[PDB]
Each structure stands twice: as structure tokens, then as C-alpha cells.
Design a binder for this molecule. Structure first.
Ligand SMILES: *[C@@H]1O[C@H](CO)[C@@H](O)[C@H](O)[C@H]1NC(C)=O
Ligand SMILES: *[C@@H]1O[C@H](CO)[C@@H](O)[C@H](O)[C@H]1NC(C)=O
Lengths: 49, 48, 49, 98
């Protein structure tokens, strides 16, 4: 080279995908409750109501 | 694309002479006296 | 050539006399002609006369 | 009057000749071309009239041998950055290096 290199990111794409999967599972299963304290389950129909 | 173009132009700009006789340090040192090659090296260093 | 003692003008343009031993020349013209003593002034580049 | 560019060149001063070294980081002087680099086998389809090649990224990748007429790729031998991992002076003096 000419002294110009690229450094790898700390978080791999698999880790980011895991974070996204966790967010999707939490929001599908517990609504907005998981973002304000303990995650409380609720059926999806009642959540959308 | 912006990152790639910035790095590519940084690589490409080395070929310019910046007013010196040549853009290669080895030639300047090989075919000039040190008192006369000093100014050429200074010009290239400042440009880079 | 350095064995010749009476050298009067030895100026070089773009090259150093001491660095000639380590250089190679793709083509060199031994353009030679005999001149008057003071005419060495006009043998210079970008100079009229 | 003379032209000062690189090869081809038919006029040279007195000098010595040394053999070929392959995959060793070696200081070299080819026909007045000073530098440092490692020479490796070239798979590039260099044409017979190609003297020295600035193929990619405007870099003097190759120079043709004045005796064996082989395509000698010129690359600088390996270099890189060094990082130091430490747990802290108050804790220990052990050090890991990256
Ligand atoms: C001498 O140099 C010429 C120039 O290319 C080359 O063709 C020839 O093979 C060389 N001879 C030897 C014995 O290396
Ligand atoms: C300095 O040493 C003390 C004693 O072990 C430790 O508790 C402290 O964390 C150290 N300082 C820092 C900035 O870690």
C-alpha cells in the first residue's frame, strides 16, 4: 500500500442482527412494556386494539 | 462511494510534482547534490 | 575525463557532476565544437545572444 | 546533452552485478532505479516491448531485467501498525501486543 489501511468494526453483522432480532421479539411479544421496565406479555390482537 | 473516492484521490495525488523536478524522492536524491535536492524534498513534503 | 586538469566550465543542468558515476543515459550526444575563450557565456538555456 | 529517464539505456558507468533473490526483502539498484522491495513471480501478460509497468494505482509494479529479461514485480516488504494492550499501571505490568 501507501500507508492507508482500514480497521474492522467492533460489532460484526451477526451481532447487529442478533440485536435486531431481540428488538423484534420483544416488541412482538410484549408491546412497548419491554422498553420501560419489566417485559409483560400480551396477546397481539389486544396490543393492536 | 464517498469514502472510496476520498481514499482513491489521496492515493492518486502522490503523482504530482508540486513544482519539483520529479515526483520521486529517489531520483532527486540520486541525481542532485544535497544542497540542491533539499529544496525539492521540502516542496514535495509540504505538498503531501 | 577527470584526468584532464585544465577544466574551465563544467556546469550541469538538472544533474550533479559527482552523481554521474551512478547514472545511466539512454542517449547522449557528444556535440562538440571549438569556440573563443569568452563565448562560454552564451552556452546556457533560455539565454539569448 | 542527454535524456535522464529510466530504461531502455545503452550507456552506463562501471558497476558490479549480483544474482536474483526471490521473496526476500532486498535493497536493489536496477540500472539506476534505487529502491527497496521484494521480487516475486509475475503472472501478468507483459508484452515484449513493455520496459517497466505502472499497471494499477499508478505504482511502479514491475521492471524488466537487463540480463534475464524477466518480469520482476516490485512490492515493498511487509509493514504495519503495532498496538499495545495494557490492564493499567496500578494493576499489573503484563502487556499484550496486537
Ligand atoms: C546480456 O544482456 C543482454 C541484454 O538484454 C541479454 O539479452 C543477455 O541475455 C545477457 N547475457 C547474459 C549471459 O546474461
Ligand atoms: C490505582 O490503584 C488502586 C489500587 O489497586 C486501584 O483501586 C485503582 O483503581 C487504580 N486506579 C485506576 C484509575 O484504576
Amino acid at each position: 500500500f501507501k500507508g492507508l489501511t482500514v480497521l474492522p468494526p467492533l460489532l460484526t453483522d451477526e451481532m447487529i442482527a442478533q440485536y435486531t432480532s431481540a428488538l423484534l421479539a420483544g416488541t412482538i411479544t410484549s408491546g412497548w412494556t419491554f422498553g420501560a421496565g419489566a417485559a409483560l406479555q400480551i396477546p397481539f390482537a389486544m396490543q393492536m386494539a | 462511494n464517498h469514502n472510496a473516492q476520498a481514499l482513491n484521490t489521496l492515493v492518486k495525488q502522490l503523482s504530482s510534482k508540486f513544482g519539483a523536478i520529479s515526483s520521486v524522492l529517489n531520483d532527486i536524491f540520486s541525481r542532485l547534490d544535497p544542497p540542491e535536492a533539499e529544496v525539492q524534498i521540502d516542496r514535495l513534503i509540504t505538498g503531501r | 575525463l577527470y584526468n584532464l586538469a585544465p577544466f574551465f566550465t563544467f556546469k550541469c543542468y538538472g544533474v550533479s557532476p559527482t552523481k554521474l558515476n551512478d547514472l545511466c543515459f539512454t542517449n547522449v550526444y557528444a556535440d562538440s565544437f571549438v569556440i573563443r575563450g569568452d563565448e562560454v557565456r552564451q552556452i546556457a538555456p533560455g539565454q539569448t545572444g | 546533452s542527454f535524456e535522464l529517464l529510466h530504461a531502455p539505456a545503452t550507456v552506463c558507468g562501471p558497476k558490479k552485478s549480483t544474482n536474483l533473490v526471490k521473496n526476500k526483502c532486498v535493497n536493489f539498484n536496477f540500472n539506476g532505479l534505487k529502491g527497496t522491495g521484494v521480487l516475486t513471480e509475475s503472472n501478468k501478460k507483459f508484452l515484449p516491448f513493455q520496459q517497466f509497468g505502472r499497471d494499477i494505482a499508478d505504482t511502479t509494479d514491475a521492471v524488466r531485467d537487463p540480463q534475464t529479461l524477466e518480469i520482476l514485480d516490485i512490492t515493498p516488504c511487509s509493514f504495519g501498525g503495532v498496538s499495545v494492550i495494557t490492564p493499567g499501571t496500578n494493576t499489573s505490568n503484563q502487556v499484550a501486543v496486537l
